[PDB]
Every structure is written in structure tokens, then in C-alpha cells.
Paper text:
Green fluorescent proteins (GFPs) are among the most extensively studied and widely used genetic tools in biological and medical research. The heavy chain variable region (VHH) is the smallest antigen binding unit and can be further cloned as nanobodies. Since [name] is the most important genetic marker for biological research, several groups have generated different nanobodies targeting [name] or its variants. Therefore, we sought to improve the affinity by linking different nanobodies that recognize different portions of [name] with small peptide linkers.
Residue numbers in the entry:
A (entry chain B): 3 to 127
B (entry chain A): 4 to 64, 68 to 237
């Protein structure tokens, strides 16, 4: 499976930004997709996850109430809607996918995914 | 692992099928209660009329809900694979007619057990018992015979379904099955044993769509020196 993230740009504090990730290949097996981020100087951070069949979502503590995750099974895309952006949201945002089944709690771990994207750069002034 | 099946578990089923070029989709929903070996499921054909008889899809539409009594629990491959799940593959050969090839992934997505299936059928007779809709809406009880497959870290199963033909005898459907874990386990490789499987096909009197309601009870039982242990 190939994961391709897009949408990153330079925005101002208080702006909105939507990211999107496109999964290609043999995607039949997808069980969840997720967004992580890494700002240079800091460790990778869970941002959001979505369960593939039903669409249940979970968010990281840093982005609750500001970020929304959604997915389109026919298009094999997963989107991250970011509102009220702040300088501390500056990072490379990565898309990940899992095919193995799971209990919900493991979806917050960076080690719980089977596939990783290249990342898209978000900078917040 | 087994711990995930101690209560009532919601189930979702999705099938995309293509039989002789007749393409169709089915969505299913229900619940399983492995404590009682019990399944209750309802299936809707979302593309219109189902081009094959509902009974021919029963085995394709979650043996992790079988009741394994205490002395059998060492042999329950299906729950041992969870939550990461397993791949279930079958060839179903209809005597004197076509065959189905199915590949399904059975796994948890959080609290929900999901069975997602792709089915391709070929070589069917357009006026045979399947494409001609000549099978009775009912279902015989059967035993599913399970054996370990060490090299695949999984199991195989063999059994024959007897489908009643309207105003006729029986249409046999030869089932060959293989199950392999999706994750790295560990999993239980069982001794030879069988699943005693009881199915009832029902209709929802208020449902306008082409559909099937299914009630199943399944219990595992041992095999000793080639003889089925009896309850």
C-alpha cells in the first residue's frame, strides 16, 4: 500500500488547514488510518485515528476540540481538518494505516501501524 | 484473546460478489455470544435482487463465536488470533455446477467484529440450481472438521453442505477452508476436532429488500482415534 499526504502550507495563527492522505494499491485490508506529527526538535506525536468500517475517531490531547478526522472508504482517503492553528502545530504531518485488527487503545501508539506516508509540511506563523 | 468474547459482541459483515459476471453486494449486521455459541445476523442485498440463493452464502457470511467448552479451549484457533484477526479462504465446489472462491478477513475494529469478504463464482449453469434459484430456503445441520496446518501457522477445514433442491433431492457444496493469522500471534494450533453447527434461516416480515435472517448455534467437540466425541 502507498500513502501520499497533501495539503501542507504556510498559514497564519488562527487559520484553518485541511490535510488529505490517499492510499493506493491493495487497500482491501485497511482496518484504521491515523495522523501523527513530528516538529523538528521534538518527538513524534499521535494526532488522530479513525476506525475504517464504522468511522469511530480518537484524538490526541493536544488537538482536541480543534482537529477533526474523517475518511472516505470509496476514495481510500483520510482527511485531517485543522482549525485554530497555533505555532506549536508546526510539524511534518504523517499518515499511517493498519490492516491488523485491534482494540481501540493501541491506535494511539506510533508502533501500531503497518504503513507510513512521506509526510506533508505544515508551518504556522 | 478469548477475553474479547465473554459478552455480546456486535458483528458487521460486508460481501462483494461476482458470479458468472452477475455482480452484487451484501451488508450484514448482528451479534455473537460465544458463551452460548450463539449468532444472530441479518443480511441485505444492497444492489437489488441477489443472483444466487441465500442458502449458498450462509457459510461465507465468524467461527470465533463457536462455544469451546473447557476441555476444548486449547484447540480454539479462531479466538487465539484475535484481535489482530485471520484470513479465511475457501473454495466451494457445487456438484455438477460452478464454484465459489472466497477470501475474507475477520478481525476486531475496537468493540466490533468485522467479516469482510470478496467472492468470485465461475462456471455456473444459468438454468442450474444456483443461478436458477431452485434451492429451498432452509439449512441442514452439519459438522465442520478442523485440522492444524503447522507450516502456515493456521488451520484447514473440510465439510460438505447438503442443500435441498425444490421438488428434488440435494445439491452438494464441497467446502475446502484455510485460516491464517493476520498478525504475529501467538496462536493455538489445534488437535483434530469438529464444530457442531445448527443454522436457521428466517425472514423479517417488514423488510422490503431482498434479505436473510440467520440464527446459528455452534459447539466444538473432540475426535478420538477417528471417532467423533458425542454430547
Amino acid at each position: 500500500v502507498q500513502l501520499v499526504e497533501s495539503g501542507g502550507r504556510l498559514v497564519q495563527a488562527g487559520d484553518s488547514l485541511r490535510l488529505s492522505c490517499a492510499a493506493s494499491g491493495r487497500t482491501f485490508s485497511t482496518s484504521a488510518m491515523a495522523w501523527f506529527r513530528q516538529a523538528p526538535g521534538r518527538e513524534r506525536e499521535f494526532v488522530a485515528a479513525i476506525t475504517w468500517t464504522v468511522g469511530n475517531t480518537i484524538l490526541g490531547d493536544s488537538v482536541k476540540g480543534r482537529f477533526t478526522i474523517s475518511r472516505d472508504r470509496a476514495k481510500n482517503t483520510v482527511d485531517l481538518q485543522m482549525d485554530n492553528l497555533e505555532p506549536e502545530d508546526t510539524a511534518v504531518y504523517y499518515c499511517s494505516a493498519r490492516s491488523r485488527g485491534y482494540v481501540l487503545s493501541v491506535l494511539r501508539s506510533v508502533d501500531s501501524y503497518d504503513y507510513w506516508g512521506q509526510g506533508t509540511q505544515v508551518t504556522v506563523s | 484473546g478469548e477475553e474479547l468474547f465473554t459478552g455480546v459482541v456486535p458483528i458487521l459483515v460486508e460481501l462483494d460478489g461476482d458470479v458468472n459476471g452477475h455482480k452484487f453486494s451484501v451488508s450484514g449486521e448482528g451479534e455473537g455470544d460465544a458463551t452460548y455459541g450463539k449468532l444472530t445476523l441479518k443480511f441485505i442485498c444492497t444492489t437489488g435482487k441477489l443472483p444466487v440463493p441465500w442458502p449458498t452464502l450462509v457459510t461465507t457470511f465468524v467461527q470465533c463465536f463457536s462455544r469451546y467448552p473447557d476441555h476444548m479451549k486449547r484447540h480454539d484457533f479462531f479466538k487465539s488470533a484475535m484481535p489482530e484477526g485471520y484470513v479465511q479462504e475457501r473454495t466451494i465446489s457445487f456438484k455438477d455446477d460452478g464454484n465459489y472462491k472466497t477470501r475474507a478477513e475477520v478481525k476486531f475494529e475496537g468493540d466490533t467484529l468485522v467479516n469482510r469478504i470478496e467472492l468470485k463464482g465461475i462456471d455456473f449453469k444459468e438454468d442450474g440450481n444456483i443461478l436458477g434459484h431452485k434451492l429451498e430456503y432452509n439449512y441442514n445441520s452439519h459438522n465442520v472438521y478442523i485440522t492444524a496446518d503447522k507450516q502456515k501457522n493456521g488451520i484447514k477445514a473440510n465439510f460438505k453442505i447438503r442443500h435441498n433442491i425444490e421438488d428434488g433431492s440435494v445439491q452438494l457444496a464441497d467446502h475446502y477452508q484455510q485460516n491464517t493469522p493476520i498478525g504475529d500471534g501467538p496462536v493455538l494450533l489445534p488437535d483434530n476436532h469438529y464444530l457442531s453447527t445448527q443454522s436457521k434461516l428466517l425472514k423479517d416480515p417488514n423488510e422490503k429488500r431482498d434479505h436473510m435472517v440467520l440464527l446459528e448455534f455452534v459447539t466444538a467437540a473432540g475426535i478420538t482415534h477417528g471417532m467423533d466425541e458425542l454430547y
